[PDB]
Amino acid sequence: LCPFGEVFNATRFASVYAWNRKRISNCVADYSVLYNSASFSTFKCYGVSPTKLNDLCTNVYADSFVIRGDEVRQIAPGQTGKIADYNYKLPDDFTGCVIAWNSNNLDSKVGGNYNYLYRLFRKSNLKPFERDISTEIYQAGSTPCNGVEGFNCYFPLQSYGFQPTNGVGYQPYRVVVLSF
């Protein structure tokens, strides 16, 4: 029996820029129990059908992180935006499922939770399944930075602002991507 309970029920989720990966190998799992569960706001399967998930194969990958509700769209085969370009990219030939659920009750705090980070600046886009965790100051213009933070010399990581009374689009959503 697969340790999916460790992935979906972990108290702490990773920041999207430092997205967590957990490989699931010699075990059995009931993929249709998760699909019809009234716990997930999103369960989109690309390349495979969510009905025939049990009647299929290999090892599985479970990537997890937290993003804004209006960024759940970027976790798809051919998307653009700060998260899809600089944080987590799924290939066009992606075979797997993107799972998400509102975690406002868990990851928002009175006055704001700023512990969840995303990459805002980068000289280049990420390749599918690439994890970038470097912290190099970004030279936004012609003035050199010299490793010193200042105007147009920005740290690449920024904090999300998770407040409980935010609208659904600005609320935290826990994401689990299963790759096959």
Epitope: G141, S142, T143, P144, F151, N152
Partner: antibody, heavy 118, light 108 residues
Framework: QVQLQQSGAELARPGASVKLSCKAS????????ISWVKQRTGQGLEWIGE????????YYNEKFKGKATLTADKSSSTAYMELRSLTSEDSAVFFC???????????WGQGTTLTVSS | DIQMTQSPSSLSASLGERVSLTCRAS??????LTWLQQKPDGTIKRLIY???TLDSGVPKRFSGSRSGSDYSLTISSLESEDFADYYC?????????FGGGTKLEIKR
């Protein structure tokens, strides 16, 4: 083609505020910083400040703090400079210019002449 | 703050003459220096960036150099179009700062 198109010649009264525009086309607005320069008739060039449109971060020359306010509009790819409590000393040509990745200012707006008079 | 001291403020010269304009930076600017030309109509054009790199569409008579904190703009042989205002600009540190300018006029 990269172009910075500034607002037309402007007349404003003393004590009044003005809002100058600098429309950018021919590249992605958030990629580069937009700066402003003041030049009074027969006088030198003065760096006013710069705005980085991607995050709205700004930096000003101390002499222009309060006097000028730079804002950006990602929707219309237009840069703005609001000039407050206008006096005859603010009558000058105002330019916008692009702070490129390297080489400082590559492109410049045509200029906007401001006249502060009653 | 970085002060760019430009000299001379005014210069009288003849066609075919060799002229040099200097900008002294009050502190280290590591060659992040631009030279601009303003024609009598107000049009600004970049001559040099990075202290010595000639911009495309700028004639070869123009060249930029650096001794220590002295940055020079040299015109090997003056032409009619060259009688104009010149300004240097440092971009090594915020706030960026201009030199006071040089008015190049015709000697007679």
């Amino acid at each position: 083609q990269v172009q910075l198109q500034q607002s037309g010649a402007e007349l404003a009264r003393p004590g009044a505020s003005v809002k100058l525009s600098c429309k950018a086309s021919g590249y992605t607005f958030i990629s580069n910083g937009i700066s402003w320069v003041k030049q009074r008739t027969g006088q030198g060039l003065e760096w006013i400040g710069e705005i980085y449109p991607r995050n709205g971060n700004t930096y000003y020359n101390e002499k222009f703090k309060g006097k000028a306010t730079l804002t950006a509009d990602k929707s219309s790819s237009t840069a703005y400079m609001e000039l407050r409590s206008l006096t005859s000393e603010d009558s000058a040509v105002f330019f916008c210019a692009r702070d490129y990745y390297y080489g400082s200012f590559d492109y410049w707006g045509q200029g906007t002449t401001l006249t502060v008079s009653s | 703050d970085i002060q760019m001291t430009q000299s001379p403020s005014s210069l009288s010269a003849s066609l075919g003459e060799r002229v040099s304009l200097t900008c002294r930076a009050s502190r280290e600017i590591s060659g992040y220096l631009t030279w601009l030309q303003q024609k009598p109509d107000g049009t600004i054009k970049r001559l040099i960036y990075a202290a010595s790199t000639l911009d495309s569409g700028v004639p070869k008579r123009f060249s930029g150099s650096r001794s220590g904190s002295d940055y020079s703009l040299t015109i090997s042989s003056l032409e009619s179009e060259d009688f104009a205002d010149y300004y240097c600009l440092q971009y090594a540190s915020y706030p960026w700062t201009f030199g006071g300018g040089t008015k190049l006029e015709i000697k007679r």
